[PDB]
Each structure stands twice: as C-alpha cells, then as structure tokens.
Design an enzyme around this catalytic site. Structure first.
Site, PDB file in Angstrom:
ATOM      1  N   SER A  34       0.755  -1.250   0.000  1.00  0.00           N
ATOM      2  CA  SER A  34       0.000   0.000   0.000  1.00  0.00           C
ATOM      3  C   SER A  34       0.789   1.306   0.000  1.00  0.00           C
ATOM      4  CB  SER A  34      -1.004   0.039   1.151  1.00  0.00           C
ATOM      5  OG  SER A  34      -1.963  -0.995   0.966  1.00  0.00           O
ATOM      6  N   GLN A  43     -11.139  -4.873   0.672  1.00  0.00           N
ATOM      7  CA  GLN A  43     -10.674  -5.606  -0.489  1.00  0.00           C
ATOM      8  C   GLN A  43     -11.742  -5.716  -1.571  1.00  0.00           C
ATOM      9  OE1 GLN A  43      -7.721  -6.364  -0.605  1.00  0.00           O
ATOM     10  NE2 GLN A  43      -6.909  -6.969   1.406  1.00  0.00           N
ATOM     11  N   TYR A  55     -10.460   2.748   5.541  1.00  0.00           N
ATOM     12  CA  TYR A  55      -9.356   2.467   4.627  1.00  0.00           C
ATOM     13  C   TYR A  55      -9.722   1.310   3.714  1.00  0.00           C
ATOM     14  CZ  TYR A  55      -4.525   1.187   3.376  1.00  0.00           C
ATOM     15  OH  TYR A  55      -3.330   0.939   2.732  1.00  0.00           O
ATOM     16  N   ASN A  75      -8.870  -0.659  -0.318  1.00  0.00           N
ATOM     17  CA  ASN A  75      -8.314  -0.798  -1.665  1.00  0.00           C
ATOM     18  C   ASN A  75      -9.367  -0.532  -2.725  1.00  0.00           C
ATOM     19  OD1 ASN A  75      -5.852  -1.732  -0.685  1.00  0.00           O
ATOM     20  ND2 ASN A  75      -6.411  -3.884  -0.938  1.00  0.00           N
ATOM     21  N   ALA A 134       1.821  -3.348   2.909  1.00  0.00           N
ATOM     22  CA  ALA A 134       2.080  -4.765   3.079  1.00  0.00           C
ATOM     23  C   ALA A 134       1.519  -5.549   1.926  1.00  0.00           C
ATOM     24  CB  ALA A 134       1.454  -5.265   4.408  1.00  0.00           C
ATOM     25  N   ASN A 167       6.059  -9.444   6.008  1.00  0.00           N
ATOM     26  CA  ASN A 167       5.044  -8.529   6.533  1.00  0.00           C
ATOM     27  C   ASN A 167       4.980  -8.602   8.074  1.00  0.00           C
ATOM     28  OD1 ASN A 167       2.731  -7.014   7.081  1.00  0.00           O
ATOM     29  ND2 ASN A 167       1.316  -8.578   6.304  1.00  0.00           N
TER      30      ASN A 167
END
Length: 358
Positions: free
Chosen positions: A61, A117, A147, A149, A315, A340
């Site tokens: 990210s 996601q 937050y 994606n 990550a 990670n």
C-alpha cells in the site's frame, strides 16, 4: 557515512530484524536531503542472494502514495477534479447510491464504507461494474473513513481515463520517468527479475497475486534507491521541473479530512510535527488503521504543511514497507522488508531513527 546515522540506524534495525525474524531488509535515510543506504540479509534465501541497493521489494500500500500523486497530477493537468461525481468518469455506474460520491471520497476512503478488499471473485471488467453497482454504503458520503483498496483503487483507475492511457502507462510516463525512478515497476520486467526479492510468509517464498485494481492499490515494486528518490521528491516538490507533477505532489499532501490527530491526504497520511510517537506508533496498528472512524471535513483542504510527519505503511502477503518524512527538517526514511511484520514495530523504529537525527 556520518557515524551518527550509521549508529542510530544499525542500533535500531539490527534488533528489529532479530525480533521480527526478517529475512532481508533495506533502509534509506534522507538526511539534509541526501540519501544513505543500509542493507541486511537475503532477497532469496534458497538461492543465497543478498539484499542490495538494487533489490526490488513489493511496496504494497505504499503504492497508494504513487496513485495519489498521479491523481494529483491529473488534477493539475485539468483532466479531472476531485469535486467531480464518480459517474462523470464511469457513466455505467447508474445505481442511486452513487449520487453524491465524488472522486475526493474515493481517493480518501470516505465514500461511505467501500470494502477493504475487492472480492477475489471479481476477475473481469463486468464483474467490477457489478461489484460497485451492487455495493450498499453503510454511511452517507464524507462522514466516515474506512481504509479501502476498493476506494482508492477505483480513484486511480478513473483518474487516468481522460488521458486515454492505461494506469500503468500513465504512471510510467507521468510519475516514474520524470522522477528518474528507472527501477520502479507495476509489472516487473523479465530484465529485472534477477533483482526481485521473494517475500516470505510462514516460511514460504511468495509474490503478490494478480487481483482487481492491484496496480492502483498495492501493486508497485521498487528498490531502496528509487524509494529514497521518491521520498526526496515528496520532501521538496519545488525542485521538480515538471509543473503538473510538482503540483500533484503538493495536492497529495493537502489535508482533506481529520480523524483524531491524523489528516488524510491523497495516499499520504499526515500528523503535525512534533508528533506524539505513541500516537503514530499505536495508530499504525491495523486495529486502528483499518477501523471505521468518523471524519471532520477540512473545508477547504489545508495545503501541505511543512511541519508534518508524513507517512504510509504497506504490506503484501510476503512484504512489509514503511515510508515517513518531515518536510520541515529535510528528513526521511524508507524501510523495505521481505516479511510482513507488525506496523507498530515499523513506526517505532522509524521514529527512533528520525527523532535521533532531527
């Protein structure tokens, strides 16, 4: 290299590597604008390949910072406006919940609960349209930050539509090339494969898998040299000759929303410096970083503040990255690892190093 930097970096990172069992790591410190590099361990354990200044790591990210800047550059070019409805660039997005959701909301995770996601089941372009059309927001736009994606990833895809370039072509031509990031990639070319570290998850060598909006949300790979140069460019955008890119960098560090003591930029996140280290260290833990939080609109956005801790964690399954910098002090750090490992350990180490040098 100045002994102070050598000592603070090694005394912080050596124990970090031991505690977290990190196979390979590269660190760059930007001090008074100049970079200093440090490497440890292995890019590929089986083949005994060491980490070098040319090793590629998955940024995860931290890629969002490139997306944010590319979006900023498109704003500066006059191709898009953050105030423009999402539907202006995706007319097929006709479902009524999209009324009132702007590119700003997508870029800053404030659309109303777009998910962390994109489902793995989303494989085709038709699948992606169905996903967004069918998504039901939990909240009105511009009220809560989550937050995601699927939020900034869509922003990136839409931001490049007017240019007619693919996201990858736009990124390469408008960000990577002008900044001379010549070892930074959305798709690692065969020529560079020898430098591409393996990530390690539960002891297995792994690379990021293909997924929808991967390039836009988490798909960049880069070396510690290129990342030091990315930090330099974001520390001092006025030294950047390409006008729209210089402007895009400034736009990505503007403050759009506040939650607690953090301010949301485009990709970048910022806190006032001096920061309370417990505040950024604890705040980096995914328990907090990924939570649903009410936001206060900053109306209008505050332009980039020089006295800021500006940062992003990243990550993938096999990699953990962190970048932080303080414009006012000409100071920054990049930490790239092929495991990670927990965010707070990253931020703690970064703060220990930057605090000692500031």
């Amino acid at each position: 290299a100045p002994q102070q930097i050598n000592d603070i970096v090694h005394r912080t990172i050596t124990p970090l590597i031991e505690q977290q069992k990190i196979p390979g790591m590269a660190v760059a410190v930007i001090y008074q604008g100049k970079p200093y590099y440090f490497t440890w361990g292995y890019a590929d354990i089986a083949k005994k390949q060491p980490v070098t200044q040319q090793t590629l790591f998955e940024l995860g990210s931290v890629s969002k910072t490139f997306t944010g800047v590319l979006g900023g550059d498109a704003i500066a070019r006059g191709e898009i406006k953050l105030s423009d409805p999402t539907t202006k660039y995706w007319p097929e997005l006709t479902a009524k919940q999209w009324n009132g959701i702007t590119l700003l909301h997508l870029a800053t995770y404030t659309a109303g609960g777009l998910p962390l996601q994109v489902p793995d089941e989303v494989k085709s372009s038709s699948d992606l349209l169905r996903f967004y059309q069918n998504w039901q927001p939990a909240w009105a736009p511009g009220t809560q930050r989550l937050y995601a994606n699927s939020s900034i990833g869509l922003f990136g895809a839409l931001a490049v539509k007017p240019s007619g370039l693919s996201f990858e072509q736009a990124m390469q031509t408008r960000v990577f090339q002008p900044l001379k990031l010549n070892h930074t990639w959305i798709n690692v070319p065969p020529a560079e494969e020898k430098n591409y570290a393996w990530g390690y998850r539960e002891g297995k060598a792994v690379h990021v898998s293909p997924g929808a909006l991967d390039a836009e949300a988490y798909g960049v790979k880069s070396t510690i040299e290129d990342m030091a140069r990315w930090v330099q460019s974001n520390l001092k955008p006025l030294d950047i000759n390409e006008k729209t890119l210089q402007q895009g960098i400034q736009l990505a560090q503007s403050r759009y929303w506040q939650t607690g003591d953090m301010y949301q930029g485009l990709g970048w996140e910022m806190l006032d410096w001096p920061v309370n280290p417990d505040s950024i260290i604890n705040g980096s833990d995914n328990k907090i970083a990924l939570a649903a939080r009410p936001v206060k609109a900053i109306t209008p956005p505050t332009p980039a503040v020089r006295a800021s801790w500006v940062h992003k964690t990243g990550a993938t399954g096999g990699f953990g990255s962190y970048v932080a910098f303080i414009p006012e002090k000409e100071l920054g750090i990049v930490m790239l690892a092929n495991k990670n490992y927990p965010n707070p350990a990253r931020v703690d180490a970064a703060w220990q190093i930057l605090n000692a040098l500031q």
